[model samples]
Every structure is written in C-alpha cells, then in structure tokens.
Target chain A: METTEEFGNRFVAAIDSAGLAILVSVGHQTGLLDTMAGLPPATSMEIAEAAGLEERYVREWLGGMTTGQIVEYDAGSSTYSLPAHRAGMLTRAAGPDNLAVIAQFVSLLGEVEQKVIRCFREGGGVPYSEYPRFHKLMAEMSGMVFDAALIDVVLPLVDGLPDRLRSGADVADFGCGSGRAVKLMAQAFGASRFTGIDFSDEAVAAGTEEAARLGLANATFERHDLAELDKVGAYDVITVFDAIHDQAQPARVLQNIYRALRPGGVLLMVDIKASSQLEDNVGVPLSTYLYTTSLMHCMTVSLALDGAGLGTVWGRQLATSMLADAGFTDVTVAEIESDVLNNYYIARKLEHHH
Target chain B: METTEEFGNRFVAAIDSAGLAILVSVGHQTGLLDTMAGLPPATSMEIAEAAGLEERYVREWLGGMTTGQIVEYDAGSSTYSLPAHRAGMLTRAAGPDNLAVIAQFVSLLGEVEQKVIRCFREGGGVPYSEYPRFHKLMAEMSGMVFDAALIDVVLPLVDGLPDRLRSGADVADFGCGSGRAVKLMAQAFGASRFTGIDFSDEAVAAGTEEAARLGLANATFERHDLAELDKVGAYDVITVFDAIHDQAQPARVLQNIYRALRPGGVLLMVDIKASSQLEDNVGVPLSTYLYTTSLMHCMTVSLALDGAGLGTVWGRQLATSMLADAGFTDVTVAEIESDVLNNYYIARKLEHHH
Candidate 1:
C-alpha cells in the first residue's frame, strides 16, 4: 500500500528503531536498566556514577532512549527517569517479562551477518563454530522460560505428566542444549532419573558441569546426536524443547524418538506454533523474527549438513502428520498462556516397535 | 504512556523489527532485493535461480519479507514479489532512494557491541581499528550525496560561490571524508584548485587514487589533520561536511579552519540539525538513530582520544556560537528539501585578524 516515498520513510524509522533496539541492549547489558529502575529521576552523571559508567556515554544513551520514548526526561532539572511501567518490561526487576534480554539477539545475530550474507551468495552456511556464544544465549532464553514454568505450566500440558515424573521414571531430553530443563526436572522430581542429550560437546559438558555444581545425582548429561539414537525402549518419557524443527533429519529423528521410547511413553514437543502454510503466519507475533532467525541460523545449520532443512515455522500440520507417521498416536497440540512462542505437543507411542 | 503489559508487547515488536532490519541488510547485500525488484511474481526456486542463491534460503528470506509486509505472496502459485512501490525504495534501481545501504549500519555497529558495553563499564572508547569497514561505508554515503548535489544544489547555497569557483578560486575541504565532495568539485570546476585534507591516511590514499583514476591535475588529497592546519590565507573556500560534531577538539578544528581560510573566504559546514538541549530533540526524524550513532561511533571515537566528544546533534545554536567564537563575521543556516538530516551553515570570515 505504500508509495516509494512512504516506503523510504518507513525504513528510516526502521533504521532508527534498529539503533534504539541496540541502545536497549546496551542499557540492559550494562545493568543501566536495572540501575535506573532502582532509582528515581537522576542526572546523567548521577546515573553514570551509580551504574559505574562514563558520564558522556550515559548522557548520549539517555538522549537516544528518551528520543525513542522509553525514558522520560525532565528538562528543568536535566534528569532522566524510566516510566515505572516501561521499566517493568525493560528492567531485570520484571524477571521473566524483561525484553532487554531478547533484544540482545541483535548483537548475537548481527555478528554472524557477514558470514550469513556470504552463505546467501556462495550457497553454504555459517556453522555452529561461527556462533560462539549461541549456547549461552539459548540457555538463558530457554532457562528463564523453563525455570518459571517447566514444573508447573509446561509439564502439566501433558495429562498426568506430574505423576509420571513423581513416580520412578526414566526421563530423556533429546536436544537438551546445556541441560537446564533436565537439571530442573531432576532437582524437582527426585524419584525420576534424568538424562540430557545434545550434539554439542560444549552444551553437554556445560550441562554435566552444571549438574555437578548443583550436586544432582539423579541427572546425567551425554553428547549424542538425535539422528543416531540407538537405545530402543530406553526412555519412559522423551522431551524436545524447541529443538525438533531444526534437526538435520527431523523425520528420522522423530522416528528415532518413537523407537527409543518405551511402550506408552509420551513425547513432548515444544515447537513454534503456526500452520504449515506460509499464508497462515501472516500476522503471527514475532513471525518476522522467527523466519529471519530461521534463514540465518536454524535452517542454514540444518542445510549445512544437507538435511531436511525444515525451517522454523515448519508449523503444526506437518508436525502432527510427521508424528503420526512415526507411529505415534494421540497427538494433541496445546498452548500455555505463559508461553506465546510455542505449542505443546503430547504424542504417545502406544505400541513398542520390536 | 504505556502500561507494563503494553511496554512488554511493544519491545516484542522491537525485537521482531530488529531481525527484519538485518533481513533488509541481507536482501541488500546478497543482491536479493535488487533481484526481486527486477522480477515478476515467481516461486522461491525461480527467484533463487535468478538470484544465484540457494532456493531454501531465498524461500525463508522471502517468508520473513512477506511476513514483515514488505513483500507480496501469491499463495496459489507459491510465488512472491516485492511491491513495485516498495521495490523503488529498497532496490538500487531507484538510485539514492534506496535505504538498504543505510540499514547496513546495524551490521557495522552491532559488531562492536561487546566492546562498547565494556566502554560503558570502563572509561575507554572503541577505536577506529575496531570498525574496519567504516571509512568505506561513509564514502558510499557521502559520495552519493556529493555527486548529486555538489555543483548545483549545495554550492548555490553560498551567494557568489559558484562564480568564485568559476573565476579560479583556491578551495580546501577540511575533514574531507574520503574526499568525495572535493573530488566532485574539482571534476566539475576545473578552473578552481581543490585540496582535500583529512586525518585518515586510508581516506587520503583512496581519495588520491580516485583522483588519479580521473586524471585530475587541479585536485589533491592529503593526510592532514584539521587540528594541525597551520596555513594562513590558503584558500577562498573551506567546506566541512558532517564532520565537526564528533571532533576530539571541535573548537580547535574550527579555529584552524578559520585561520586556514583567506580573508573573505566562505566556510560551508554540513552538520546535524538539532538543538543545543537534549529536550528539544523529541519527535525529530531519525532522532533515536542520530543519538545512538552519536554514542556508539561519534562520541565514543572522540572520547577514545580523550577529546571533546561533542557528540552528534550538537545542534545549530552551538555550531553558530562556536563559529562566532572562532572569529567568523556572519553565519547562516540553510536546508534543502531533499536532505533531511543536515543543516547547511554558511559562515564567513570577512576581516583579517592581523
């Protein structure tokens, strides 16, 4: 609907917002957001000294933040304050609601931009080695959601899941990046044995170290590819949290999970919610980020291995079909109010494959 | 103005837009935007083949573009196309109307996020070496503006200026970034002798090479810092384009320019149009970007040298005051309709101090 002039102006605004987004990252990363939240109105120098930052940079950062309409500036006193309402979303004081953590993806993904651009032209991809801090970022992202909701909100999405974990059971997380979820599970459900598996040596090692740090004897971490799963009927419950969609061989991996699960074992898939058709995703929240991250990271990594390359937003229709094809019955997709990014799928392998 | 829930939702949109900003960068960098601009509605594979990109990457890229409402999708045909109007502003075909080049600043500045964060904690700056491709990007930016407006629109802002050049006046451009403005002037006004001076050796070298390529004998570019301009009665006209605000010693640089100019010489400074007070910048076009860039690149680079760090949006009032303090006689600020980001200041030193 835009003419060229409007389109031009729109992106000028986009460029401006892009910078402000990073400014938010700066505020969040430097603990400025938290510092501001804890204080009343203050001068730039006051804010700087309080946050242990240089005055000039903080002044200019406030200049942008104010202009971007996140911070309120008092001209007479030359002081700036975040609106209590705005701070509730931007500051660590908001806990899980803090978005500044989410905005740092700009920094994370922006680093891989040059390599991704190269991939576009030359037909290769940026590998995992290229994204150095991805595991840390991903863990923080999932950890917050899992910690806040895993025991109550997410687990209960599968009927009787709490009881399953309360009794003696074998729980395996197929793509447990850094194993925070499994660790939480092990800590909470002393009756259950937990195993966390991922392809990354780093994530698994971090998972193991964290397990040791927590002194959890019920949990173990192992570096294993989901595509190479060979333990038939090993797990009473298998969970894939936001991981199944990006697997190199997603269908094969699903089949592997189905075979690995004991009869009557349930598979819990936490994946992005949408229809298989691209048209259905037109107005979904963060659909743009979802797809952009898909091309830049998830899909490309899978494609790098010459795998199925099912990008993020591969969606629910195909997911259910694939689950059914892998010999799973009673496939039901549910959503939790707290988690907007994903659909919770409960798939049961009722008959064990001999 | 927003409640906490609204603020939270707002930044979710910001995070989504941040990713889209990078998507625009990719569309620009990989020649995809240009490719789509020239094409009819086509399937992802067809567009990929046309762009010489992997079909899946192109498909996912298109998915984001369409989701962002920048591209149109044809569901029945499984094809996509950029709207002609949007294409006009995004693709290179529209010449300077394209903003994709500008959006790439995200890619450039995002690289230095960690360093800048530390600068917030510690009191140092991100040096020039940290931003390797900055000079090249700045040249592309200024080159287009200078090439389009040098002889006609910009030079005419100063009365009798075009005639001064036509009648064989000596010209110098202080802080001539990559020498695009000087090169354009020298190429256009051959009777005028032009010298471009800048602090960067790389810019001077590139400027010199471009001049040699054009085989212009009347023009020269040299690695000369504006702070060290010792020449008196050197030139009739001196131009500084968008370079004054971030100078380590802006006043010293201006004083040097005043002395370097002959009596009755004209000084044309192109700088950001802003107020001396931060409060005055609310609702300004690109306000957030202006201040963010000020903190990230402009102020930090100057602060790195322990200089003035005057920052971008130093505003016209301070600029005029600074000019008057530097012994300028008359100063005027003007604007062209096409250029929204800058105020063109025409300052004259009509008398010799001695």
Candidate 2:
C-alpha cells in the first residue's frame, strides 16, 4: 500500500545502512569503538593512535560513521565523538545492547553470498565448515544477551525455577555454544550442577576454556551430537537458547531433550519471535531479518544435511506443535519484553503415571 | 538527540534492508522479478518453472520478499504476487526506477570488502582491474538513468542544448563507461557526431559492440586515458556524467575538458550531490553509501594510481573551486529534482575576446 517514492526511499536507506553496517563491523573488530569511548571528542588521529590502527583508514572509517550519523562530528573543531548515549549502545559495557556486536552478522552473511547463490542453482546448501567464525560469532552474540539478562530476567521466567536452582537442581543446556548460559547459572546458583552440550568441538572447547578461566568446578561442557544423545531422566531442567530450529533433526533433538529431562522437569526453549502465517508477520519487528537469516544460514545448514529446514521463522505455532509432538504435553509460551528478537517457552514434561 | 531505542530501531531496519537488498539483487540477476511480473499471483513452483530456477530456492526467495514487504502473499491460496504497484518499481519496464538494479551495488561493495579491509590496514588501494564486472555493472546503472532522462530532463538542463544536438553538434562524453549516455544522445539526436572516451578497454569494446548493434554510424567509442587527453577545441559539448571526483587528477581532467571545448561551448559535469563540509552531510540521503563507495572503489582506484583520491563527496564547493582553478570562469550548479543522488554543473568556456 506504500507509494513508489516511499519504497524507493526505503531501498536507498537500506543501501546506505548496508554500507554503514560493514564499517560498523570493522569498527567493532578493531577496538575502534572502545578507543572512541575512552576519548573525549578527539580527532581521528587521536582515536587511531589509541586503537593502534592506521590514521588514514581510521579517518575514512570515521567519515563513514559521521555520515551514517552513528557518531557525531564538530566541523569547526575537526573533532569527532561518540555521544554518551550512543557510546552505551556501541561500547562493550552495554553487553547485549551493543549493536556493533550484532553488526558482525552482516559481514558474516555477506561472506557466504556466493555460496548461497550457488545453492540457489544446485539445489544443495552451504556446509557448517564453510562458516569458520560462525560459532565464535554466535557465542559472542549469545554471551552478550545472557550476560545482560540471564540472571535478572530470563531465569526468573519459569515458576519456582530460581528457588530450584538455588536448592541444587541438575541442569543441562542443549546446543549451548561456549557454555555462557550454563556458566552464568553456575555462577549465580552455586549449589547447582550444570552441563553444556553441543555438536561443535570448537564450541565445547571454548566453553571449557571459559569455565576453567572462571574456575567454575560445578559446570562441565561436552561435545556430543544431540541427534545421537541417549541420556534418560538425567536432569531436572533442560534449556535451548536460540539454537533449536536449525538442527538436522529438530524433532529428534526435541525427543532427546524430552527423554533427557526427568518427569515433571522444566524445559525452557528460546527462539525467534514470529508467526507461521505471513500475514501475522507483516508488521513484526525484524521479520525481514529473520527470513533473510533463515535463507542465509538456518535453512541452508539444515538443508545441507538433508534435514527439515524449519528456519528461523518456523514460528510459534510450528514450535509449540513440534514440542507437543515431542511429548512435552504441558507447553506455555512466554515473552521477555526487553528481548524483542526472541520468545521464551517454558514447557514442563508430564509426570509418569502408572 | 535520538533515544537509544530509536537508534536501535534504525540500525535494525538498516540491517533488514541490507538483507533484502541482497535478495533484490538475486531477484534481478536470476530474472525472478521479470518472471513474477508476467505471472498472475502464481505459486512459487510456477514462477520458478517459468524462470528456469529451482523451486525450493525460489520459494525461499519469495519468503524473503514477502516478509520484506517487497512482494505480496495470499495465505489462503498459498500464492505469491509482485503487486502491480511494486511491479512497476521492480520490473525492467520501469527502467531507472527499478531499484532491483540499484540493489546490485550492495553485493558489489560487499564483494570488495576484504580488499577494502586490507587497504585500511596496509595503506594502499584496490585497482580497477581487480573488479572484472565493475564497468558492466556501472554501464547498466548509468544506462538505466540515462535511458529514462538523458534526452528529456538532463539535456534540457543545459539551455538550448537539445537544439544544438539536433543541428549536429560535435559531442564527446569523457569517462563514458560502455558509452551509454553517448548512445542515447546518438539515437535521440541523429545529427550529432558523438565520441565516447574511456580508459577501460572492456568498456570501450562493449560500447563499440552496442553501437554496431544499434547501427549508430554517427557514434564512436575510443579507449583512451583521460589524463593524457589533449584534444584542441574538437568538441562543441563535453560531458562528464557522475565520473569526476575519483580521477587521478581531477584538476587536470577539468583542464583537459576546458581546452577540448570550442569557444562558447559548454561542459556539463554531473557528480554526487553533497556538501564539502562533513557536518552538512550528516543526515543527507545516501551519504553513507557515498562515503563507503568512496572507500571501496572511488578513492581506492585513485589511490591505486597515486592520484588525488578525492572521494565521492568532494562536494559542490570543492568541485566549483576545482573548476575555477582549471580556468573555467563561469560555472553554474543545477539539480534535477528527480535524481536525488547527483548534481548537474553546466560550465561554459568563454568566447575569445578580440
């Protein structure tokens, strides 16, 4: 229903954002944001010197940031500054709120564009190995989100969950990249024991290193494929955070989780907030992003393994149905108002009746 | 002055746009848009069949467009459509208005990201030869714009220019990649003898082939470096369209252009519409794109040749000052309201005073 001029304007804005997104990724990777954060309305040279980057390149990057309006410039003084408010969103201190961390996804997706193009022709998909830094990037992304809200908002979502954790419940986080959530739980609830499982050895290794670095004796990480997982009634709680739908066999994985949890145990699954129907998703925030991410990564990874490519926007209906089919009879979907990108589902396994 | 939430929303919107832009590029490249344009609310399979593309891939692409609001979906029939209104902006029939063509710039810039990164660290630039399809892409971009407006809007900007062309004025277009503007002028004004000059052999060959195909005997393309151009008053009108700032020596090029024009002859130079001051350009449309393009291609190409590296936003102030320095005394800057991306400068060489 929009006019052509409005559409054209949006297209142009999007193009500009694409360009700025690349530079923003670079700024984040190079410690430029941190340098700028510490400085007081400095010249590009001053910030570049602090960041140990070449001045000419830093100057050009500042130009991009200034033009993008991500940073402010004083033409009279030939100085630049990250506004205090923007610094909070861009700097590391902001944790999950730091947009520069998320900007990396733009470059990551762009790197695999040719592979995606080929997939469109060959009827195949890009492999996980093709994305070398994906695990690291995802770990960083999830780490930020968890660090900001896991203790304060997310953990408290399930009824009596915090009390149970404090009283020493056995917890397992499935597909827990880098064990960030598990470590946070371990740190917050000292009496609880935690285990993190993922198919990626690199991710497990990273998690192990971080756990050891933090000297968390109760937390452990293991490299194991969820599809082959055979544990039964081993944990009081199971959690999957933004990692389920992309699986080679999400149904099997869900069944595994169901079996892994004790009867009456809580299973928390966090996923993209969306709807199965396109009409319902028309005005959803970041809907286009979810679909595009599905096209680029989630669906492709699943398709690569000849699995069900449920994608990022598999939606609330499909997710609940899949959970019910996996034998978690009592299912409830919850939302963390602060986290606009995801929905939290707290599903409890039915107690076995003789 | 904006809230963090507002900024975050803008960033997210930009990211979504970046993703959609890539899909838009894919649609244009694969002829999906054209196929969809001809169809009547068809299923993905039907559209794919008509376009000779894989159905699954086409389906996923359609999902992206639908969610992005670039296309429409009927949930009831499971059918997709390029809305008649959107089709006009997306289809080839729309010519310059087809934003899908413009979306290619996102991927083009993304493809050269590594090179730009290296240049940032290593203090050098990417060469023109490094980008194989650049001239072709640029030709297509300029072709669309000129096809829509060359004879009608742009030519009329220069007073009495169309009448001069009608009477067979000697015309030369400097840095005419693939000679799109030259060809348009040749076809529109049959009496004009048109010459297109460019350093790129690939562009020259393409222009030459297109001229032959069109059977335009009055139009010719020459592969010659503009820096070495030393023509003596051979052209009644010399035009540089969106191709001045990135020159190795823009001043020298302007001098060459000034000398090449006959007495009282006019030189029209079209370049980016922006301000010389960074502060003035903060909120300008496409400013981020201009600066990023400068980093990725323009300034880099100039730097590759140890040239001025005067980026895309050298701006009207610098442009006019450079023109004046090149011995052009009377220069007027004009704007074509329809083209938000560029500025038109009509500069005239004074008649020799006896």
Candidate 3:
C-alpha cells in the first residue's frame, strides 16, 4: 500500500521526468552527449562551438540536463560536464547500455497522442504510417538489446544454438526491423546464411543497406508481410524478437514460422515478460511503459487493420497457449537474467508430424 | 553528492513518470478520474462503462496508473479502485490540488517540439498562434494557484492590500489569460472594480464569458497588448501572476506597469522562484521542468518576437534589479509556504516621484 505523499511525490517526479526524457532525446539527436563526453568540464559556449550548435540553445538545453541531474554543473566556473559514469549510460560509446537511445520512445509515442486519445473516444486506431520514425526508433532501441547480450546471453539460452550457428546453418529473423539481430548474427557467424524479413519497406531497405555496407554476401533482406509468408521448412532456426504480440495475425505468423522451420528445428521468440492476469503484473518494472506503448503503438497498429490487437503484454500464459495452438509440441520458457524486460521462448518442431 | 546507482534509479523513474504524466493528463481530460472517483472497487469494464470510454484503452491506461502507484488494485478480485486519499489529489473535487491539470504541460510542450528544435537550429522561435491551448492550459493551471490560496495567502502578502480590496480599490491584472484571478478577486472583493487585460483575444473572450457567467458586473476583460500599453496612473493596484518573464520587452512592460499605477499604489507581481546563477539552483524542486519549459515555451515565445527572452529563471537577483531599473522602489520579496514554485514581489511607488 502506498501513502498519499508517496503517490504525490511520484506523480510530480514523473511529470518532471517527462520533460527530462524529451531533453535527453534532443541531446542524443543533436550530438550534444557525444560532444560533452569528449570535452572536459566546459562552458556552454565552448561545448556548442565543439558541436557546431547555437550557443544560446545549447546553454538552455544544458540547463535542463543539469537540473534533471543528467549532467553535472559547476557554478564557480559556470561549466557543465557529463559524469564519466553517466556518459557510460548516455553516450553512444556505451552501445547497448545507452539509455538516451531508449528515451526517444517517450517523444515518439507522445507524437501520436491525439490519435490515441481519439481511439479511446471513438473506438478507432492510428495507422503505422502515422509514425514515420517508429521503425528507426525501434531499431535503435533493439540494437541496444542485441548489442549487449545477444551472442553471450540470448543465443546461449537455447540448447545447442551457439554450436549450430558456428557450424553454418540457415537462419531467418521474422519481423526483423532494420535487421539488427540478423546483421549481428551474420557478423558473428560468417559461415551461416542469414535472411531478414519484415513488413516495412523502410526497414527492409535499411537492413539491405547495412548488409551491403558491411559487404556480407551471405546476408540478405526481403520485404515480406509475416501474415502472408508461406515458406516451408526453409530454415534451421527462425527468431522473432519482441515482434509477435503486435501482429495483425500472430497465429498465422506463428503457423508460418512452424512450417518454415525444419523438423526438430528451433523457433526462438522473445517477448515482453508479463502475466495475462493484471493482478500478477502489480510490481513489474516498467508495466506502465509497456501498457502505454501497447495502447499507443502495438495494439493500435493491429486495430487499425481491424485485426486482433493482442498488444505487447499478451503475457506468458496466452503466449504459451498460442504457441501450442500454432502446432509446436515442445515449448520451453526461458529468460536472460540481465534482460528483465523480455522472456525467451524456445519452441521446437517435432521430428514426426501429427 | 548523489551515488551513480541513485542517479540511475532517478533517471529511470523519471522516464516512467513522463509516461504517467501524459496518461494522467489524458485521464483528466476524458473525465476518467471523476468516473473512477465515483466508483467503488470495479473492473476496467465497469469503470469504462461508467466513463463512456473504450474498455480496452481504459484497461491499458489503468495499467499505467496502477503500475505508477497512482491508483490501487486488488489482485484478489482483479478490481481497481482510486484510493480515497489519492482521489483527493487526482479527482475533480480536489479543485486546485488535482495534479492531472498540471500534467497537461508534458503533452502541450511536446506538441511544439519540432518548432522548438527548428528554433534551436535557426535564430527564431515558435509564434504564439502555434500553441492554441496554451492560454487555456495556463488559466486552468494558475486557476489552482489562485483558487486555493490567492484570497487567503497571496493577496495578504502585500500589507493592508486585502483591506484596500475590500474597501473599493481599482485593480488591474496584466497578462491575465482567461482572467481566473480577476474573476476570483471580483467575486471576493465586490467593492473593488476589476479589469483583466491580455494580448490574446481568445483569452480575453473566455475571461469575458466567465465573468458574465458569474454575473459579476464589477469585473471586465479587454484585449490589450501589454507591450504596447501606455496607460498612466489609472490603476490603484496592478498585478501580474506567473507572467512577465517571457515578454518580448520585459523592461518596457515593467516601465508601463510602473506608469500605470497611481502614486503609493501597489504592484503585486508573482513569478517563478529561482536564482540567477545555475550553481545555486541545484537540488531545487522541478528545476528540470522550469528549464525545459523555458526552452520550449517561455523563452521561445519571447525569441519569436525578437524580444529579450528573459526565460523563466530570470531569478530574484535579475528580477529585483530589473524592477529597480523600471523606476520602482521599496520592493519586498515574499513567498507562500504552500507554493514553492513562485515568488511574490510587493512593490509600491513613492508618495511623490520625479
């Protein structure tokens, strides 16, 4: 039970944080974090000169960062510095650990607020086209997730997955926006052929560009709506990362994934860690964010198409039951302790069909 | 002197809070808070039915509220309830205490992000017409400040001011958007003749309607740009509440204000409570919000007109110095214990001046 004071304080803090989130995103987008990270404690003018941004605007943004406690300010010299520890979480050098990358979601979802509100009132939804940078934002966000733990933590969660990838097996990443995971896997396992598929043309084009830039002959990307996929036993491993829940036809996508995998092959599905029952999600970290994002993006996208809006928090029970219904006989639920936001499900197609 | 872990915790909490703030605003705008306030422990469907909102969106929003700890949930029955204590702060009945009213700022500023970013790149700013609801939002927000404490706390800060108001003094509130304070003052001090002036025609119209609705013939509103005003020695009392910092020409406005008041008349100015120095602002409550809003709205609005762009945190030092520069004397700064966000300046013209 929370006290009124606690609630009040939290509510106020949350309002402030919303402001901070937008500023952080702006800082990230403007290369201010990188500039600040490279310089010693410097005046706003000095930092702005280095970054080639307007000094007055940079000064005000620094004020926000300092007040938000994201940056440290020294009043004596009127200088601002990104603390070394903070730099590890804010600068691009931090790779997957950079939270500034994640902060963009606040503003991105905020951009669609009017549509979301209208949906609530009129029983309609916002289309994917309404969010122009959503794929790019999601890619950057998921890039962090895979950059930090994909090989050592996530891939190892499944039995014999690493050895299989090392020995050169065919792999496909379904709903692979910008193909970050596929590219990482392709880079790590040069012998394995990788194919990335997505419904978004922009994502496919970006993934293709990345593959070409990396000069990976074995990697390729194709724009394919998962709901319409009809591949049969074409891959040894099919992976879907944080993408299944929002699908207009998740069941159809699952059936396609099942059919696309060879007998005894693996389907590695990563999704939000939650329970179908709201009661069980009480103390879950970032439940508010998950649900809000679902309402603003995931569920709304499906609803826009008049499809099943399973949402982000379809949860373990609904997910497992759905996997079983999709023709997977053996399914194992697993997790990477370092990644608290998602659950890993490794389901195998049986050697003998029913 | 905060630890890295503490900073990280606060940063994450802030992100969550931002989401909560927007959702809280939506709830308030949709009257969901009021609907919940009137209900006992109920499921999302029951609450949605009562509120006339879509069940799915309401359920998702409730997830945010519950996880944010703004509302209570019973896992046993999967029923949600607004705690009585929480209701007092969140519901409409709480009047000025409802923070949901304040939460609208997050989305409101967020809407102008592109213009703000463009201003950061270029040397101009977003125009007033861009923000349609700004005056309306500010009026509701300040409505809380004046509705709760203006009569008992703020007005009393000026010595013998209440007696004067009761005994029929001429009062004018400049930059009086939607005229909340004017209406309140008119109702409370019937003996006083009240006038409200704002640059926004919309605000003046709304204020006029509000005054008429209350049947207060003593109160009237007029659309007059403060920057262009040349009135002389007319008002016995001149007041500006939480305005003036973002003026295109703040000094000129102050000079006009000084000239508008009769000899020995009071100029009760209420503005943000902050220091001129960044070093001194560390650990101040809502400092992040103040700075962010300055960058996005206040300062930009001034910059839009090629004004001084004094911003929100012009600070007491700068403010007092400017007041003196505008030919005012005997200025005293005071505060209300309940309101930590603003400072009250009580200044009076000399009995005989040059």
Give DockQ per model, in order: 0.78, 0.50, 0.61
In CAPRI terms, model 1 is classed as medium
Over A166-275, each residue of candidate 2 has an lDDT whose tens digit, in order, gives 99899999988778899899999899999999888987998899889999999999999988897899899999998789898999999999989998799999998899
- After superposition, candidate 2 runs with Cα above 4 Å error: A17-23, A39-69, A73-79, A151-153, A160-171, A182-194, A206-220, B41-64, B74-80, B151-171, B182-195, B207-220, B230-236, B259-266, B350-354
lDDT score, residue A181, model 3? 91
Lowest summed lDDT window (length 10), candidate 1 chain A: A127-136
Clashing pairs in 2: none
Model 1 chain B lowest lDDT segment of ten = B128-137
* TM-score of decoy 3: 0.92
Superposed Cα deviation of residue B109, candidate 3 (Å): 2.5
Docking class of 3: medium
Residue B61's lDDT within candidate 1 is 90
In candidate 3, which residue pairs get closer than 3 Å at backbone N, Cα or C atoms, i.e. clash? A14-B17
Query: Could you give candidate 2's per-residue lDDT for residues B1-354 as a string of tens digits?
Result: 698778878887777777788888888878899989999988988998998877877877888898788889998998999877777877788877787877777767767776777776677678987876665777677887887788899989999999999998999999998888998999999999999999889889999999999999999999988988878889999999977898888888998998899998899999988888888888888888888888778888887887888888788899999999988899999997777888899999999932
Task: Rank candidates, DockQ, best first.
Answer: 1, 3, 2
Q: Model 1: how far is B152 from its true place, Å?
A: 0.5
- How well docked is model 2, in DockQ terms? 0.50
In Å, candidate 2's interface RMSD is 1.8
Q: Give per-residue CA lDDT, model 1, range B69-150, as digits (tens).
A: 8888989989899888888788887566678877787877788888888888787788866776765777676787787777
